[PDB]
Design a protein around this nucleic acid. Structure first.
Ligand SMILES: [Mg+2]
Ligand SMILES: [Zn+2]
Lengths: 143, 344, 303, 101, 171, 98, 87, 137, 297, 263
RNA sequence: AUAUAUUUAAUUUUUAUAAUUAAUAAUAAUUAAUAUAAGUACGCAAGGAUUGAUUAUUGAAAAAAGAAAGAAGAAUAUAAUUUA
């Protein structure tokens, strides 16, 4: 017969964006990141996007019986400093198999280490062109 | 559960010695009518029955002699006194939190959980209210987010004055049992909740305004039809009913969001009792700053939440020890993580 | 399962159907001076009416020793209240009993209990000695009358123990426990009984229903609705003839019959009279009754 | 006393029909207090066979309950329903004349 | 592959009306028995030159088994790896709701029309029931639970990753 | 409500001890019309209000309907006045004046 | 909480009126003794339901149920253990 | 206004008046100078065996006004350290775990050598509720 | 304190098996405390011993009426309990075996129920009780082998030289209190008992209440059943050449004896002799049951 | 379930899914439930307390909450017991066969419950075994003398037939040699056929024979009295030959096989 | 392939505070398959048990009292980030 979709209840409509100031939320983020660092799920990093972009990386995904290892080229780093957000874009090619992964830091069953903070933009461009050509070939063979 | 007719409550179905009321003192025989004329012609007034006497005597002897063998049979008498936490009767009031932010965590098995952190600024038991003093009709109002006096409206500042509790921004009522009371003005520490605890949360999702019938119901809104009219299954005769009006509940375009949404049975992830934060692995729809309300889940899968196998709650409410100082205690020291769980 | 086949509540008969069925069964509303339905809805005959029907039917061919016993039984409370005048009626009953049937355990035990209530322990002893001399050995009822007379007159515990031990020796009373506990049980029973004047015993309770017609005519005494407390006279005569023709099957109660008695499989359907009310039948008119000369006076209690 | 008979007897005093100065416009009457409704009696098979039905605003919402169901829910509901019927027998046009009694 | 909860009860129901007997746990087959392509066949068409006349007769044999594998896959509802071919993203999806539009089965069409009526019956009885059940928080959660399209390219075209990795590592 | 809790539940003897307070609280509870809370919400006598005696389960008049304001206090006072019939001697009526 | 052998092994639920004794030696099933003597396990399910309307009349001692004397007082049968109405 | 709606709208004040009349009998006691809380008879007959020979337990709980006032006024005691520190278990352990392996029997495949104290598969599957005597988990 | 200690002794029964320390000490020796109908009486005797702690590590009450503990031809299991000595701290592992019997169940149990329904007398059952004493290497705790050998030559039994005198005296006290000191014996006495049972089987046997049949067997134990049970008891006692003994007595054995021989081989742990027995026995219900005993493919 | 919801699972599932209409107190109900406490019923008047009647039908209460202080009434006290009298204990177990009288014997037995006039050292049994006695068992019975009158039978067709068939069943009863214990006596001038039974102790019992009493009825009476007498002997200290499998039991399993093959 | 009436979807703008009353049995007929249940009764053999818990959808269900012509942002998501 009849129903109501909105509620003007005071407890529901009231907000706390004005009082969010007394909560050290950024300090909580940093504390979570530091707890992860001290536990060992991640390792602190301080690099910029253009510096890390194009640097080889090795990632081991722990798995009984054999942990799977993968050597790729860092294509994009989402964060310049360590945080709970993180994010890395790696590109690795096996024998006739290309793949583009988004590795999040802090996973205990995942240990990724960049072999050098320095990167070569030339090799980055080479890997980017290879990946784009593979993607275009796949799409053309599909359609 | 198991069906049990009231007519099956005779002494031939009782598991323990059936005790008749018999005025002030319980007896093992039905109350003999004081007026002898009331004796029905076939009613056999029993004063002493050796069968029942021997059975009851042996039962009492064994109960008093072997307490370890007959420990479970002790609930027949000396029941648990009122005031102690009960597994099937004691429900405690929840709290009022503020959705602080979102992050992602990982368990030791390797599962990723996109969690949201709620913040409980100042939880204080504000009021008690029962309607006309009936059973189970009493509830406790808890207030949150202490504010100055120039903030609230006059008619609500007047209530906070009348109560004497420091004026809070919001106030939510939780219906509880009388043995779970807490004096007015009691501070509620976040450790009132446990990390391995299922919680039911209620909030207000975000507002999208007037949205199309496609965006409201997704693919469901495009096709809406319902016919309760009679239709001939076999060509034998002719007869049907015309669907004159549109049946109530027809899915159309209208207000979207800005409603009271309730999630039932989400487990807690971690608790920080220095900044009063709770983490839940479920992504909510509400905005940042929506005053959510947390309450305890009654039971799931036919199993009560609070039991000896899982753990005992902080009944009625968690009170910290005296020598504990959250100022001296660091942030990393105030972290309680739930035991691992896999959901795939 | 949840849909009930039978229903005990709410009731299925209004008030008028009570009167209709009462007049249908064949019962007659007798005045209070004759008898009435007590608190337990049982029909109770006034001692005066009992003595009247005794005086009127003591000569007929259907009178019996058991009828004389029941007459003395009905006179018992009046004898307890006034042992001076009612003992004359009891003695008249005993005289007629000796004229017609003679010496009998029934009449002797009845007069022994009458003397016990009338507080005549010498008379109780004389009656027991007369039984022993005539050759009627004292029965368990006689020894219990001895004990009751002792307790009522005020004879001591050892005086009553003498009679109890004599009964045990004779064998009329079978005991399954120690003699002390058996005597304690019998004394507790007699104490709960009490007398019509001792304010502790059940007999002290003189409250009565005082209703010419029972309140609920469909009251059950057993398990099913077919075992009604009030039945028609044809069925009652059937029960009476069965009680004598099949008196053997009453001795044993076997689990077969016990589980057969369960009415869980008996039919419970609404007969045409369950819709049309009990069949209307005329009541016994009393136009031939003389006009009440003391209609303004109030009738007193039975005893 | 049976339900319809007691309902008619109650309504005749509720609506004020027993008064010689009864006027259809002026709704006056006597306050009847009905007692022991839990012990009201209807003849056999009626508590099971007599239906009480109504319609709700939702489609196919034809509720049909037995007298036994309405009695186990609330015994006063049966007496109120029969009083409503006995009243609407004569006053159904005006909401006042059909509700006020 | 364990069958769907609602679909399993649909086979138990149709079996009681057909055989007039209680369903047998060995006949209803609550676990879908999906068959992979033979290891020899993938390497058969690989080393076979395109000019080989025997390649068409074995290619047609694989295309038929490639569709049969789809027919057995749609009967499951457990989480399974499904990659899209448009943007080539790998995600976990349920085969029944994802491959519903490609399989083109009338009984899968009639159950979809049956469940839409079943939802309308509950929503028409109580209008407010839609408020809690169908909300933006609930609608977005159910779409992530049944990813009928890729969250990156929003394409309904998908492929069984298990069959794909079986075809790659052998070819 | 606070006066009721103070004079009924926790201190049930103050009224019987002091008859002046009894009459004073009675006259105050008569001056403020407590037994007809509809006159609290009515604004014109030609259209009386039902804010207190009416309530519907949809959610209307929840906090304002059926207020047990002075019912318990009035019951305690009438019970104190009926205590005389069971006590055979008037305590309150002997303490108070004509 | 830690495991429990009482929770491991179930127990029969028999009403107190039908129990022969509250001893732990008899708190088990009655068919168990016969199965132990016969050296074979029995799994007979749903042996008997009570009734759709279970009724049992009052039962008295073994000696009393056959050696009840005909001791009567004013209108009530009076036994050392029971009272009843007489006519 | 539906039939049930009108019935309840006209009867709810009458229900409240009836409850007030009921509590007036309780207030009669405190009026005479003897404040006595209401007493309820404790029922010892709450453990039954149903028709199908299984255990049923009725739950009867009473409320004490003095204990209610005490919990209203006095603050609760200090929460237990272990109670607030030890987290609650997530998964509910079964009533009888099936270990399938015992080190006592020399030949593990010997079905007759396994000790009896280890619960069986039938108990592992059927024992989902507490035993007849013990009511709580 | 008393109630707490008593409930600790009670929870000693609720304790599980895996976490109970069984193979804690190196040296171990088994003894046969006799055959009893109700082993709970002997268990109570063992519990009420001054030389043992009142709080065991693992207790298991034996109830021959529970469906999971009914002695079947296919053994339901072996009840295990554990006790700790007070002064020597030695372990006592009491085993109540139920797989010793070799009787086959009746074909029609209803006839057997009708036969033994109204019987006011029930035949005794022969249920064995074994005790494994476990102790570590002790040089002076046992008091030298001379004292133990003197005790052996005095009491006719045999004990280890390094066995604790406390455990030995506790066992002797329990046996003399229960009165089964004559039935109590080790492997040396079990061999003599087996020879005596062989002589009895060679001798003619008296008639029982009624001859056992495939439809109605006789719950009274026969000489052949006793022989098979004692062969199983010797195998449990771990006689060194029990395999050779079974291989020698196989041809002269009946079917009730061969069933016990198969169970004894299964207890010993060799598969070749068990397969030989199960292949040499003619097809029958006994053969089907002995195949049902062990898990197969 | 709106309002206060208790942690008890499924406590209102039989009433539906709503906590509504709890104020009610009179519901539809069968015998033994609801407001039938005013009405009288033979079984329930002794099997239920008039205050124990609750809600009937689906409204059966699995969780009841009330206000007010709980008044725990004291347990009943055992009567007819001497203060300071130490009772003997009887350990019952399934190892003892159920047919033995020691199982039905009292467990908690004082000295004040022991009959001294009979001459027993223990109190007698309380509950008797329930069995449709179809045959006699003359093991605990010394002898039986059935005196019957063969003069005229048109006066006792039922009684004479009953007594004669009872004598026939007593001859065919379960005994090693019942012909040595059963005796029949023709009385040319007798009032009514009598059956005297003498046990091993020598007690004389007379089963009354009335019209409508069947031979099976007489057998059941005699066997019940025989069990009582055997209990008396065992209490006095006399030893009795226990019941076991006999050739009569085999002859009975014959017809058992016959009926089990029939149906 | 015409703007209508009934009927529906909403809204009437912080209301400190849900629902003892309309949703009159049930959101599935209080489920429920599943590894482990069992290389096991039943079957000469071949083969083949009843069965209910952790893996799932199982919480079934309506938030109606306060002063109103800005953008409900002083707008670049801070309740003023210093401010002449
Ligand atoms: Mg507003
Ligand atoms: Zn994609």
């Amino acid at each position: 017969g009849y129903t109501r979709e909105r509620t003007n209840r005071h407890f529901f409509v009231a907000r706390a964006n004005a009082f969010f100031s007394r909560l050290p939320i950024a300090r909580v983020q940093r504390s979570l990141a530091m707890e992860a660092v001290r536990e060992g799920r991640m390792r602190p990093w301080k690099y910029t996007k253009e510096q890390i972009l194009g640097a080889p990386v090795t990632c081991n995904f722990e798995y009984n019986p054999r942990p799977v290892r993968l050597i790729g080229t860092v294509m994009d780093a989402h964060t310049e400093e360590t945080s709970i957000k993180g994010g890395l874009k790696v590109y690795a090619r096996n024998e006739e198999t290309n793949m583009m992964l988004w590795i999040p830091p802090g996973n205990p069953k995942l240990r990724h280490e960049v072999t050098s903070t320095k990167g070569s933009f030339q090799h980055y461009l080479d890997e980017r062109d290879k990946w784009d050509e593979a993607w275009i070939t796949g799409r053309a063979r599909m359609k | 559960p198991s069906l049990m007719r009231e007519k099956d409550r005779d002494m031939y179905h009782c598991y323990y010695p059936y005790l008749f009321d018999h005025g002030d003192k319980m007896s093992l025989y039905p109350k003999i009518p004081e007026n002898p004329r009331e004796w029905q012609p076939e009613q056999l007034q029993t004063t002493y029955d050796a069968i029942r006497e021997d059975k009851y005597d042996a039962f009492i002897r064994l109960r008093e002699k072997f307490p370890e063998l007959y420990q479970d049979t002790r609930a027949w008498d000396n029941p648990p006194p009122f005031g102690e936490f009960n597994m099937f009767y004691s429900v405690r009031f929840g709290m009022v939190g503020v959705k602080a932010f979102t992050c992602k965590d990982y368990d030791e098995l390797g599962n990723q959980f996109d969690c949201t952190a709620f913040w409980f600024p100042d939880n204080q038991v504000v009021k008690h209210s029962t309607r006309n003093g009936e059973v189970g009709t009493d509830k406790v109002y808890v207030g949150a987010m202490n504010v100055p006096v120039e903030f609230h409206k006059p008619h609500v500042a007047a209530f906070y004055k009348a109560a004497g509790v420091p004026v809070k921004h919001v106030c939510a009522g939780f219906p509880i049992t009388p043995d779970a009371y807490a004096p007015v003005g009691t501070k509620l520490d976040v450790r009132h909740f446990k990390p391995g605890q299922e919680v039911t949360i209620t909030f207000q999702n975000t507002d999208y305004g007037f949205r199309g019938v496609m965006f409201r119901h997704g693919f469901d809104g495009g096709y809406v039809w319902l016919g309760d009219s009679r239709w001939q299954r076999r060509p034998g005769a002719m007869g049907t009913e015309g669907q004159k009006r549109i049946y109530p509940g027809h899915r159309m375009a209208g207000q979207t969001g800005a409603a009271a949404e309730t999630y039932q049975g989400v487990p807690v992830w971690r608790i920080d009792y220095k900044n009063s934060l709770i983490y839940l692995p479920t992504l909510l729809d509400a905005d940042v700053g929506t005053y959510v309300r947390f309450s305890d889940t009654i039971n799931t899968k036919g199993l009560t939440l609070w039991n000896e196998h899982r753990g005992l709650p902080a009944f009625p409410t968690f009170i910290p020890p005296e020598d504990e100082d959250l100022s001296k205690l660091a942030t990393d020291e105030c972290q309680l993580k739930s035991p691992p769980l896999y959901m795939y | 399962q949840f849909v009930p086949l039978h229903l005990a509540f709410p009731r299925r008969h209004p008030n008028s159907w009570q009167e209709r069925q009462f007049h249908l069964l064949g019962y007659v509303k007798w005045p209070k001076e004759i008898g009435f339905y007590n608190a337990g809805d049982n029909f109770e005959l006034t001692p005066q009416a009992a003595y009247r029907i005794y005086k009127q039917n003591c000569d007929e061919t259907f009178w019996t020793r058991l009828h004389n016993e029941k007459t003395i039984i009905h006179l018992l409370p009046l004898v307890e209240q006034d042992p001076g005048t009612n003992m004359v009626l009891v003695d008249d009953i005993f005289r007629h009993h000796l004229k017609r049937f003679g010496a009998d355990h029934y009449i002797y035990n009845a007069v022994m209990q009458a003397a016990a209530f009338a507080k005549d322990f010498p008379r109780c002893e004389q009656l027991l000695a007369e039984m022993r001399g005539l050759g009627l050995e004292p029965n368990a009822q006689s020894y219990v009358n001895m004990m009751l007379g002792a307790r009522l007159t005020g004879k001591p515990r050892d005086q009553a123990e003498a009679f109890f031990r004599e009964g045990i020796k004779t064998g009329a009373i079978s005991a399954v426990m120690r003699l002390d506990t058996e005597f304690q049980m019998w004394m507790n029973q007699l104490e709960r009984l009490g007398s019509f004047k001792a304010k502790v015993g059940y007999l002290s309770v003189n409250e009565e229903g005082a209703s010419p017609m029972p309140r609920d005519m469909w009251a059950l005494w057993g398990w099913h609705r077919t075992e009604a407390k009030f039945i028609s006279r044809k069925q009652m005569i059937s029960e009476q003839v069965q009680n004598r023709v099949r008196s053997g099957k009453e001795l044993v109660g076997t689990v077969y019959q016990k589980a057969r008695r369960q009415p869980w499989a008996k039919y419970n359907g609404m007969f045409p009279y369950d819709y049309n009310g009990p069949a209307r039948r005329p009541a016994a008119s009393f136009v031939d009754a003389p006009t009440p000369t003391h209609n303004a006076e109030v009738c007193g209690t039975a005893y | 006393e049976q339900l319809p008979r007691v309902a008619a007897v109650a309504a005749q005093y509720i609506t004020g029909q027993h008064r010689p100065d009864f006027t259809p416009g002026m709704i006056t009457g006597d306050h009847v207090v009905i007692v022991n409704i839990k012990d009201v009696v209807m003849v056999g098979d009626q508590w099971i066979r007599v239906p009480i039905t109504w319609q709700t605003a939702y489609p196919g919402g034809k509720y049909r309950i037995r007298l036994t169901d309405m009695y186990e829910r609330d015994p006063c509901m049966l007496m109120w329903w029969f009083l409503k019927d006995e009243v609407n027998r004569h006053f159904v046009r005006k909401l006042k004349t059909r509700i006020a009694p | 592959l364990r069958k769907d909860s609602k679909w399993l009860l649909e086979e138990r129901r149709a079996f009681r009306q057909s055989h007039q007997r209680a369903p047998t746990t060995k006949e209803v087959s609550p676990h879908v028995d999906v068959a992979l392509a033979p290891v020899g066949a993938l390497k058969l068409s690989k080393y076979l030159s395109p000019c080989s006349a025997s390649r068409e007769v074995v290619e047609h044999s694989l295309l038929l088994h490639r569709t049969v594998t789809k027919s057995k896959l749609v009967q499951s509802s457990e989480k399974t790896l499904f990659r899209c071919l448009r943007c080539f993203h790998v995600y976990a999806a349920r085969p029944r709701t994802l491959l519903r539009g490609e399989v083109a089965q009338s009984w899968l069409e009639y159950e979809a029309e049956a469940e839409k009526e079943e939802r309308a019956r509950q929503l028409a009885r109580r209008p407010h029931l839609r408020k809690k059940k169908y909300s933006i928080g609930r609608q977005r959660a159910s779409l992530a639970n049944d990813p009928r399209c890729c969250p990156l390219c929003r394409s309904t075209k998908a492929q069984w990753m298990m069959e794909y990795v079986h075809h790659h590592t052998h070819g | 409500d606070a006066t009721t809790i103070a004079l009924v539940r926790e201190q049930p003897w103050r009224l019987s001890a002091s008859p002046a307070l009894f009459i004073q609280v009675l006259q105050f509870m008569a001056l403020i019309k407590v037994f007809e809370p509809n006159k609290w919400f009515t604004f014109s006598d030609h259209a009386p209000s039902n804010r207190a005696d009416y309530r519907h389960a949809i959610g209307v008049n929840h906090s304002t309907a059926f207020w047990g304001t002075g019912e318990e206090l009035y019951d305690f006072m009438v019970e104190l006045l009926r205590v005389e019939d069971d006590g055979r001697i008037p305590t309150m009526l002997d303490l108070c004046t004509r | 909480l830690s495991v429990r052998t009482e929770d491991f092994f179930s127990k029969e639920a028999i009403s107190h009126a039908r129990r022969v004794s509250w001893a732990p030696h008899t708190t088990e099933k009655k068919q168990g003794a016969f199965a132990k003597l016969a050296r074979s396990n029995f799994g007979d399910p749903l042996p008997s339901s009570f009734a759709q309307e279970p009724y049992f009349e009052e039962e008295i001692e073994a000696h009393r149920k056959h050696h009840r004397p005909d001791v009567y007082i004013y209108k009530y049968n009076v036994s050392p253990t029971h009272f009843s109405l007489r006519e | 206004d539906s039939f049930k709606e009108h019935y309840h709208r006209v009867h709810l004040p009458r229900r409240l008046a009836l409850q007030r009349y009921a509590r007036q009998q309780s207030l009669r006691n405190a009026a005479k100078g003897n404040v006595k809380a209401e007493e309820v008879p404790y029922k010892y007959n709450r453990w039954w065996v149903n028709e199908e020979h299984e255990f049923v337990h009725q739950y009867a709980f009473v409320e004490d006004p003095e204990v209610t006032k005490a919990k209203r006024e006095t603050l609760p005691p200090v929460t237990r350290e272990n109670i607030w520190k030890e987290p609650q278990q997530t998964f509910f352990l079964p009533f009888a775990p099936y270990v399938r392996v015992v080190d006592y029997p020399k030949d593990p495949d010997a079905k007759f050598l396994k000790p009896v104290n280890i619960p069986r598969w039938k108990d592992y599957m059927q024992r989902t509720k507490p035993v007849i005597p013990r009511t709580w988990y | 304190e008393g109630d707490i200690l008593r409930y600790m002794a009670y929870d000693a029964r609720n304790a599980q098996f895996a976490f109970a320390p069984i193979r804690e000490f190196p040296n171990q020796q088994e003894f046969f405390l006799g055959e009893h109908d109700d082993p709970e009486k002997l268990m109570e005797h063992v519990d009420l011993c001054p030389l043992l702690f009142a709080i065991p590590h693992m207790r298991t009450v034996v109830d021959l009426h529970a469906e999971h503990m009914i002695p079947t031809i296919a053994g339901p299991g072996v009840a295990t309990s554990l006790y700790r000595c007070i002064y020597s701290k030695a372990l006592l592992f009491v085993q109540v075996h139920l797989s010793s019997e070799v009787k086959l169940p009746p074909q029609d149990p209803e006839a057997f129920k009708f036969m033994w329904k109204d019987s006011q007398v029930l035949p005794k059952m022969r249920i064995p009780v074994f005790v494994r004493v476990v102790w570590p290497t002790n040089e002076r705790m046992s008091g030298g082998g001379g004292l133990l050998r003197r005790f052996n030559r005095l009491f006719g039994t045999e004990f280890a030289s390094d066995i604790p005198v406390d455990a030995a005296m506790a066992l002797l006290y329990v046996m003399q209190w229960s009165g089964h000191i004559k039935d109590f014996l080790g492997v040396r006495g079990m061999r003599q008992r087996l020879a005596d049972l062989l002589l009895a089987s060679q001798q003619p046997e008296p008639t029982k209440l009624y001859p056992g049949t495939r439809e109605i067997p006789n719950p009274e134990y026969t000489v052949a059943e006793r022989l098979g049970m004692h062969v199983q008891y010797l195998a449990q006692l771990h006689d060194p050449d029990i395999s050779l003994t079974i291989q020698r007595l196989l041809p002269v054995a009946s079917a009730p004896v061969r069933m016990g021989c198969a169970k004894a081989a299964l207890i010993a742990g060799d598969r070749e002799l068990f397969r030989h027995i199960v292949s040499s026995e003619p097809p029958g219900r006994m053969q089907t049951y002995m195949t049902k005993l062990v898990r197969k493919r | 379930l709106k309002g206060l919801v208790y942690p008890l699972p499924y406590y209102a599932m039989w009433r539906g899914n709503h906590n509504k209409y709890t104020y009610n107190k009179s519901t539809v109900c069968l015998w033994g439930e609801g407001d039938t406490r005013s009405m009288y019923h033979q079984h329930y008047a002794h099997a239920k307390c008039p205050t124990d009647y609750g809600r009937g039908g689906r409204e059966f209460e699995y969780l009841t909450v009330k206000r007010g202080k709980m008044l725990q009434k004291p347990l009943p006290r055992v009567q007819y017991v001497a203060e300071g009298s130490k009772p003997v204990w009887l350990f019952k177990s399934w190892h003892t066969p159920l047919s033995s009288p020691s199982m039905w014997e009292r467990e908690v037995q004082y000295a004040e419950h022991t009959p001294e006039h009979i001459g027993a050292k223990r109190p007698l049994a309380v509950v008797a075994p329930r069995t449709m006695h179809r045959y006699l068992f003359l093991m605990h019975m010394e002898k039986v003398t059935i005196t019957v009158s063969p003069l005229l039978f048109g006066y006792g067709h039922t009684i004479q037939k009953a007594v004669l068939d009872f004598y026939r069943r007593a001859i065919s009863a379960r005994s090693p040699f019942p012909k040595d214990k059963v005796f029949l006596f023709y009385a040319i001038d007798h009032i009514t056929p009598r059956i005297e039974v003498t046990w091993l102790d020598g007690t004389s019992y007379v089963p009354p024979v009335l019209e409508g009493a069947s031979s099976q009825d007489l057998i059941q009476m005699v066997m019940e009295e025989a069990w009582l007498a055997a209990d008396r002997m065992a209490a006095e200290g006399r030893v009795l030959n226990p019941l076991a499998i006999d050739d009569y039991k085999w002859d009975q399993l014959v017809v058992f096989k016959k009926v089990r093959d029939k149906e």
